[PDB]
């Protein structure tokens, strides 16, 4: 076991509207966007995002 | 305390393991270097008869630098 | 005294209550759920990883026959092939032409790098909840970790709190769980002994260093074809590798109720579900006589501006006339409005501005200033911001969630309809006996 230096992606911009958000994501390389709701149902998502 | 991902100085502040036994003093009292077995000397680093790692420029500079004085012995550098 | 309080289990928003007994000044109670731990009782079934196929050196009997002998090793396949005539660097290794026989063996092992890359198949039974609390009563602040089962008198020093059973039994884990390098999955792994080739758990063992390895990896031994010495074999792909390819996403990302799944031990931390019927036992020294506490002769609450939001989007000023200085508690006796502070300085006559949070579009909550309840009436507008970064402090009721203007109009329409119904009733009863007396 050891420690590796991993990249930090560009912090996304959040557009706020009624009962939702928009993430404006910049990723030069495949990056993972994971979401989940904090209630009885998760509705979890997973995506590898490349590009803006 | 702090996680095994960090090495604790003998001060209370802990630096990561990549900074321990790396040849650089980053503990206030130097407790991250004077414990590991990385006793190697650099390519340009002169080595005393006592084993200390002294820069090559320090050799026969006119003043004793190393503990045993081998850096300024007449045998080690003729005068 | 015992204070039956029901603290909502959400980690970080204090729950403000007020405890009184006749003849004593009210006390401010603040219970904060700092951390939660859902630790289930686990049982280690087996350990799996990528297998290492071990093909021993072939055995050749030049003019004779070889037998297959039973072995304990994992997936021990053993076959005997006649008429081989094997070749090494140097030519023929046997002197017979077609009476030679080759013994092909191939068992399976644990790869050397499995001390890191391996999965632990666990069966988890019912879970237990352990919470760290921050009871602040009066002036003292206490820290204690208690088990939410309803019977343990978990007590730091003297507070003697009992955490009653959680209202809704919840667990992010199903009966079977796979742990691999800190990632926790909800996988229906095969049982110990029923292993399929090409599926997760085709090789199993109680420990990485145990001698009881069992495997079913479909090792088929083939007849040698080339002249050079060869053991030809074909095998199913590693079920561990296939599962690693199509594992899905971990519970650390698919968990409900915002739970943090952690390993060693397997636990879910900081979950927000249900309610904790917590019973407190305040030391009698904290309480004080009403005679010594300041008394409020007249207090009136006027509310300046309010938006119902997750944060403290309300302001409240009240003018009091107290006969004596000191400190006094402030508390909102409603579930739809919660005050930010718990105590304030009381000096003769004055006014104090207290910020609160509400979810109803009408601040119709009743505030207490060391007794002498007062009612506040307001006109709470919707918030300007759409998305906030902080949880809601009060629940969403039904009676409070509808404004009084909307209540007035809904009641007006329903009462109008009932009014037509009742006037119809009175007119038909007034006409019935009139017709009866007509003849
Ligand atoms: Ca260092
Ligand atoms: Ca010198």
Helix (H) or strand (E) holding C267: strand C267-269
Neighbours of B12 (CB within 10 A): 9
DSSP assignment of C4-51 equals EEEEE--TT--EEEEE--TTB--EEEEE-EEEEEEEEEEEEEEEE--E
CB contact under 8 A, A38 and C272: yes
Residue B47's DSSP bridge partners are B53
Name the nearest CA neighbour of B43 among B23, B25, B60, B68: B23
CB contact under 8 A, A38 and C385: no
C386 chain-A contacts, CB cut-off 8 A: 16-19
Q: Nearest ligand to the C-alpha of residue B28?
A: 1
Do C53 and C106 touch, CB atoms closer than 8 A? yes
Obtained via which technique? cryo-EM
Distance from CA of B15 to the nearest CA of A (A): 12
C225 secondary structure, DSSP code: -
Name the nearest CA neighbour of C320 among C356, C391, C370, C394: C370
C253 chain-A contacts, CB cut-off 8 A: 34, 36, 44, 46
Q: Nearest ligand to the C-alpha of residue B48?
A: 2
Name the nearest CA neighbour of C74 among C109, C31, C50: C109
Q: What whole-number distance in Å separates Cα of residue C126 and Cα of residue C40? A: 6
- Ligand 1: distance of its center to the CA of B64 in Å? 27
What are the two backbone dihedrals, phi and then psi, of residue C24, each rounded to the nearest 5 degrees?
A: -125, 155
Q: Which residues surround ligand 2, an ion (CB under 5 A)?
A: B 58, 61, 65, 71-72
CB contact under 8 A, B5 and A3: yes
B17 chain-A contacts, CB cut-off 8 A: 2-3
The answer to whether B and C touch (≥3 CB pairs < 8 Å) is no
Q: Nearest ligand to the C-alpha of residue B15?
A: 1
DSSP assignment of C351-363 equals EEEEEEEESSSS-
A2 chain-B contacts, CB cut-off 8 A: 17
Q: What whole-number distance in Å separates Cα of residue C390 and Cα of residue C312? A: 11
CB contact under 8 A, C387 and A38: no
CB contact under 8 A, B5 and A2: no
Distance from CA of A21 to the nearest CA of B (A): 35
For an interface test with A, the pick among B6, B15, B18, B22 (most A C-beta atoms closer than 10 Å) comes out as B18
- Ligand 1: distance of its center to the CA of C151 in Å? 52
Helix (H) or strand (E) holding C424: helix C404-438
- Indicate the SS3 state at residue C233: strand
For an interface test with C, the pick among A1, A19, A32, A42 (most C C-beta atoms closer than 10 Å) comes out as A42
Q: What whole-number distance in Å separates Cα of residue C172 and Cα of residue C251? A: 8
Neighbours of A19 (CB within 10 A): 6
Q: What whole-number distance in Å separates Cα of residue A35 and Cα of residue A14? A: 14
- Indicate the SS3 state at residue C82: strand
Q: What whole-number distance in Å separates Cα of residue C155 and Cα of residue C161? A: 6
Tell me the CA distances in angstroms from B16 to B9, B28, B31, C25, one per residue in order.
10, 15, 13, 53
CB contact under 8 A, C256 and A40: yes
Do C308 and C360 touch, CB atoms closer than 8 A? yes
Q: What whole-number distance in Å separates Cα of residue B3 and Cα of residue A39? A: 31
A21 chain-C contacts, CB cut-off 8 A: 387
For an interface test with B, the pick among A2, A3, A4, A5 (most B C-beta atoms closer than 10 Å) comes out as A3
DSSP assignment of chain A equals --------PPPPEEEEETTEEEEE---SS-EEEEE--SSS----EEEEE---
Q: Nearest ligand to the C-alpha of residue B22?
A: 1
């Amino acid at each position: 076991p050891t420690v590796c230096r991993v990249p930090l992606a560009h912090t996304p911009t959040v557009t706020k509207w009624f009962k939702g958000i928009t993430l404006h994501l910049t990723a030069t390389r495949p990056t993972l966007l994971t979401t989940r709701k904090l209630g009885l149902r998760a509705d979890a998502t997973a995506e590898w995002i490349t590009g803006t | 305390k702090c996680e095994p991902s960090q090495f604790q100085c003998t001060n209370g502040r802990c630096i990561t393991l990549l900074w321990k036994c790396d040849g650089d003093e980053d503990c206030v009292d130097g407790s991250d270097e004077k414990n590991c077995v990385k006793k190697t000397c650099a390519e340009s680093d002169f080595v005393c008869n006592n084993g200390q790692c002294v820069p090559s420029r320090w050799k026969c500079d006119g003043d004793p630098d190393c503990e045993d004085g081998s850096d300024e012995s007449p045998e080690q550098c003729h005068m | 005294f015992e204070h039956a309080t029901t603290v909502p289990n959400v980690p970080g928003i204090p729950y403000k209550a007020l405890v009184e007994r006749a003849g004593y000044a009210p006390l401010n109670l603040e219970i904060t759920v700092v951390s939660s731990e859902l630790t289930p009782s686990t049982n280690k079934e087996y350990v799996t990883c990528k297998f290492h196929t071990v093909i021993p050196s072939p055995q050749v009997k030049c003019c004779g026959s070889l037998e297959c002998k039973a072995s304990s090793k994992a997936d021990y396949t053993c076959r005997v092939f006649g008429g081989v005539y094997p070749f090494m660097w140097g030519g023929a290794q046997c002197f017979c032409d077609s009476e030679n026989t080759q013994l092909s063996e191939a068992y399976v092992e644990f790869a050397p790098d499995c001390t890191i890359d391996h999965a632990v198949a666990l069966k988890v039974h019912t879970a237990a909840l352990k919470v760290g609390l921050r009871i602040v009563y009066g002036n003292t602040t206490a820290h204690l970790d208690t088990f939410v089962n309803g019977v343990t008198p978990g007590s730091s020093r003297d507070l003697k709190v009992i955490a009653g059973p959680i209202s809704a039994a919840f667990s992010p884990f199903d009966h079977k769980v796979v742990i691999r390098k800190g990632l926790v999955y909800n996988y229906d792994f095969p049982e110990y002994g029923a292993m399929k080739p090409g599926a997760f758990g085709d090789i199993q063992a109680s420990s990485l260093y145990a001698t009881d390895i069992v495997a079913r990896t479909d090792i088929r031994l083939l007849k040698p074809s080339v002249k050079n010495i060869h053991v030809p074999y074909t095998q199913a792909v590693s079920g561990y590798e296939m599962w690693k390819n199509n594992s899905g996403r971990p519970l650390q990302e698919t968990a409900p109720f915002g739970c943090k799944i952690e390993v060693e031990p397997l636990r879910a931390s900081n979950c927000a579900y249900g309610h904790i019927p917590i019973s407190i036992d305040i030391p009698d020294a904290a309480f004080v006589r009403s005679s010594e506490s300041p008394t409020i002769l007249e207090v009136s609450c006027t509310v300046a501006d309010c938006i119902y939001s997750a944060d403290f989007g309300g302001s409240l000023t009240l003018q009091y006339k107290a006969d004596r200085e000191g400190h006094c508690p402030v508390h909102s006796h409603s579930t739809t409005a919660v005050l930010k502070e718990a105590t304030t300085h009381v000096t003769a006559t004055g006014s104090i501005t207290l910020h609160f949070s509400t979810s109803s579009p009408q601040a119709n909550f009743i505030v207490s200033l060391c007794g002498k309840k007062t009612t506040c009436n307001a006109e709470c507008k919707p918030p300007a911001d759409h998305i906030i970064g902080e949880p809601h402090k009060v629940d969403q009721e039904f009676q409070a969630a509808v404004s009084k203007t909307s209540w007035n109009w809904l009641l007006a329409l329903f009462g109008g309809a009932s009014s037509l119904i009742v006037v119809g009733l009175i007119v038909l009863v007034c006409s019935s006996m009139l017709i009866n007396t007509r003849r």
